[PDB]
Design an enzyme around this catalytic site. Sequence first.
Site, short mmCIF file in Angstrom:
data_model
loop_
_atom_site.label_atom_id
_atom_site.label_comp_id
_atom_site.label_asym_id
_atom_site.label_seq_id
_atom_site.Cartn_x
_atom_site.Cartn_y
_atom_site.Cartn_z
N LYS A 105 -3.06 15.95 -8.91
CA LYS A 105 -2.21 15.73 -10.07
C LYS A 105 -1.32 16.94 -10.40
CE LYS A 105 -3.15 11.39 -10.88
NZ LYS A 105 -2.12 10.35 -10.61
N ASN A 150 2.49 4.55 -10.63
CA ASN A 150 1.21 4.33 -11.30
C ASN A 150 0.01 4.41 -10.36
OD1 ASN A 150 -0.78 1.69 -11.90
ND2 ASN A 150 -0.57 3.12 -13.63
N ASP A 169 0.86 -1.17 0.00
CA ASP A 169 0.00 0.00 0.00
C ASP A 169 0.91 1.23 0.00
OD1 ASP A 169 -1.79 2.18 0.69
OD2 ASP A 169 -3.19 0.65 1.42
N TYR A 222 -15.83 19.31 -11.90
CA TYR A 222 -16.16 18.01 -11.29
C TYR A 222 -14.96 17.13 -10.98
CZ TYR A 222 -20.78 19.47 -12.85
OH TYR A 222 -21.94 20.18 -13.09
N1 NAP Z 1 -7.93 6.18 -16.38
C1 NAP Z 1 -7.69 7.44 -16.75
O1 NAP Z 1 -8.38 7.98 -17.60
C2 NAP Z 1 -6.56 8.24 -16.15
C3 NAP Z 1 -6.35 9.55 -16.59
C4 NAP Z 1 -5.31 10.30 -16.06
C5 NAP Z 1 -4.50 9.74 -15.09
N2 NAP Z 1 -4.72 8.48 -14.66
C6 NAP Z 1 -3.81 7.98 -13.63
O2 NAP Z 1 -3.12 6.81 -14.09
C7 NAP Z 1 -2.82 5.97 -12.98
C8 NAP Z 1 -3.42 4.58 -13.22
O3 NAP Z 1 -4.82 4.74 -13.43
P1 NAP Z 1 -5.80 3.55 -13.92
O4 NAP Z 1 -7.05 4.23 -14.45
O5 NAP Z 1 -5.01 2.62 -14.78
O6 NAP Z 1 -6.12 2.94 -12.47
P2 NAP Z 1 -6.96 1.61 -12.12
O7 NAP Z 1 -7.18 0.76 -13.34
O8 NAP Z 1 -8.05 2.02 -11.18
O9 NAP Z 1 -5.88 0.84 -11.21
C9 NAP Z 1 -5.42 1.42 -10.00
C10 NAP Z 1 -4.06 0.81 -9.68
O10 NAP Z 1 -3.51 1.53 -8.58
C11 NAP Z 1 -3.23 0.65 -7.50
N3 NAP Z 1 -3.47 1.33 -6.20
C12 NAP Z 1 -4.52 2.12 -5.91
N4 NAP Z 1 -4.38 2.55 -4.64
C13 NAP Z 1 -3.24 2.02 -4.14
C14 NAP Z 1 -2.61 2.12 -2.92
N5 NAP Z 1 -3.16 2.87 -1.93
N6 NAP Z 1 -1.44 1.45 -2.73
C15 NAP Z 1 -0.90 0.71 -3.71
N7 NAP Z 1 -1.49 0.60 -4.91
C16 NAP Z 1 -2.67 1.25 -5.14
C17 NAP Z 1 -4.16 -0.53 -7.71
O11 NAP Z 1 -3.68 -1.73 -7.09
P3 NAP Z 1 -4.64 -2.76 -6.30
O12 NAP Z 1 -6.06 -2.27 -6.52
O13 NAP Z 1 -4.36 -4.10 -6.94
O14 NAP Z 1 -4.20 -2.63 -4.87
C18 NAP Z 1 -4.19 -0.64 -9.22
O15 NAP Z 1 -3.04 -1.35 -9.68
C19 NAP Z 1 -3.40 6.68 -11.75
O16 NAP Z 1 -2.39 7.54 -11.18
C20 NAP Z 1 -4.50 7.55 -12.33
O17 NAP Z 1 -4.86 8.64 -11.47
C21 NAP Z 1 -5.72 7.71 -15.16
#
Ligand code: NAP
Lengths: 248, 248
Positions: free
Chosen positions: A156, A86, A59, A148
């Site tokens: 970020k 990530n 975590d 929102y």
């Molecule tokens: N999706 C988008 O459109 C988007 C846009 C801009 C930026 N991002 C950023 O890109 C990154 C990945 O996003 P995603 O959409 O691919 O996320 P996602 O599919 O929801 O996956 C979240 C990942 O983060 C891990 N995680 C969450 N909280 C954690 C914690 N407290 N400790 C350790 N691991 C943790 C989870 O691991 P477990 O659940 O297995 O513990 C999982 O591997 C994030 O920083 C997100 O804010 C995403």
Amino acid sequence: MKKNVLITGGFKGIGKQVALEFLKNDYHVCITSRYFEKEKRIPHLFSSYEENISFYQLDVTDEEQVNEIINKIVKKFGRLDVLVNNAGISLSDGLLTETKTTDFNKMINTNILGTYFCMKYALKHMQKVSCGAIVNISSITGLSGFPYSILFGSTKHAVIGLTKGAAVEFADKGIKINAVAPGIIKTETLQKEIDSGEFSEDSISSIHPMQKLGTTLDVAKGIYFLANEDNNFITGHVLSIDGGYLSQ
Amino acid sequence: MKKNVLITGGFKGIGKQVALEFLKNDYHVCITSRYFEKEKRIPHLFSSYEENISFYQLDVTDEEQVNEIINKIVKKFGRLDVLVNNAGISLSDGLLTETKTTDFNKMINTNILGTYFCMKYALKHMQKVSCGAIVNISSITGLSGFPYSILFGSTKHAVIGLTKGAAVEFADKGIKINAVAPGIIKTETLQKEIDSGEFSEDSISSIHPMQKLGTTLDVAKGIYFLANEDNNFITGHVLSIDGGYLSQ
Ligand SMILES: NC(=O)c1ccc[n+]([C@@H]2O[C@H](COP(=O)([O-])OP(=O)(O)OC[C@H]3O[C@@H](n4cnc5c(N)ncnc54)[C@H](OP(=O)(O)O)[C@@H]3O)[C@@H](O)[C@H]2O)c1
Ligand SMILES: NC(=O)c1ccc[n+]([C@@H]2O[C@H](COP(=O)([O-])OP(=O)(O)OC[C@H]3O[C@@H](n4cnc5c(N)ncnc54)[C@H](OP(=O)(O)O)[C@@H]3O)[C@@H](O)[C@H]2O)c1
């Protein structure tokens, strides 16, 4: 004999694709989950790459565990070429006046403090060898105002701050520290929200000038470019992966 | 059968290394000079690649010639996958008050108009097939104020304007248009200005947080990343290749 990368995550979304991209480029990849039960998924999620993947329960909000895990990796592998921050969450409420402080604190803890902790202990080791790359994940909301998503965007923005600050601080130590700023990315989570009909793809696609969503591969490729050994001179930079969003 | 790239340049500095980078990635490369005599150098500069190189004489300030050359390339190869606007000049004098209008006009002509002409005619062709990539070369001076390089900086600011403007305009047409913003790059020209002793390498490299100069390969790698077939979602972006300069 292989370069070694730690990704905070790796089992879903961007993180999984980032893992795949580094694996395809001959890295040993350390992947994490908060949930130990995910370790058994490895052979099935990463068919031909099993032998080049190591699992750690982590975590990122737990500073002691971050230090422990990074120390374990360095002891076992004798190297840490790349850190990819990530791990991140978005708790998307409504307008600012209706947002929950508890939501903001959770996003701060994971998105800002988690990234800070991982950077802090990775750089302790990278400092010693005067090399390494860190890639942080910000967002278009880290460079613009997004209704929102104000609180998420604030976290970020803070990530970009950590990126640029550390970059300038470690620039003379041969360490590259950069960020990517993704637009809206079609992850599994989003794909099933589109599949359940509660969101039209074309509706949110229109947000980007390219009139399509980003893919996890788009993000993984950008991250890989910033992290690989052929990056000798890019640092402190935020790479937009957003179909032109930030250029308007 | 090979992807096809036009580079305005190819015989010296950044442009030559850009040529080399695309050649190593299985492209047919069109390279240019204002000087027809340079064609005979090709088997010697590009020993193992000549079969994949085509030479065109081109002065980018001549709009008629730009249209002619781009037409000839499309006719002969039936494709134009990438345009790299490399051609550019810096005519440095003293303070703004001392600068020569003729110098400013020369830089405007080559740096702004040349890039515009090549974009204009390349996009007429790319528009038809709804695909293609353009990479423009700006500078750190296109994103910041740089004493003694104000006029050059102004032209490189204008380059970013053309980059972002066209990106948004052609984003829905499947065409990616980006720029690179290099810091100080050690070209043959600089390498001898160091060798003559009119400048210490440490002296000028100290402006970058990384405390070294950029290389032509640094820039070529960045341009290649923005231009290649795996870029699906990066457009309107300016990639800094500057040892951290713009992050402070
Ligand atoms: N999706 C988008 O459109 C988007 C846009 C801009 C930026 N991002 C950023 O890109 C990154 C990945 O996003 P995603 O959409 O691919 O996320 P996602 O599919 O929801 O996956 C979240 C990942 O983060 C891990 N995680 C969450 N909280 C954690 C914690 N407290 N400790 C350790 N691991 C943790 C989870 O691991 P477990 O659940 O297995 O513990 C999982 O591997 C994030 O920083 C997100 O804010 C995403
Ligand atoms: N060097 C740096 O530190 C630095 C920093 C930031 C940005 N840049 C930019 O990067 C680009 C390349 O710079 P460089 O230092 O590699 O340059 P360079 O070594 O001086 O080479 C100049 C190139 O531009 C071509 N060129 C000049 N005027 C032209 C014209 N009117 N029509 C067609 N071609 C023309 C030259 O071709 P011929 O002479 O063979 O005709 C040559 O290929 C330029 O846009 C420059 O402004 C350079």
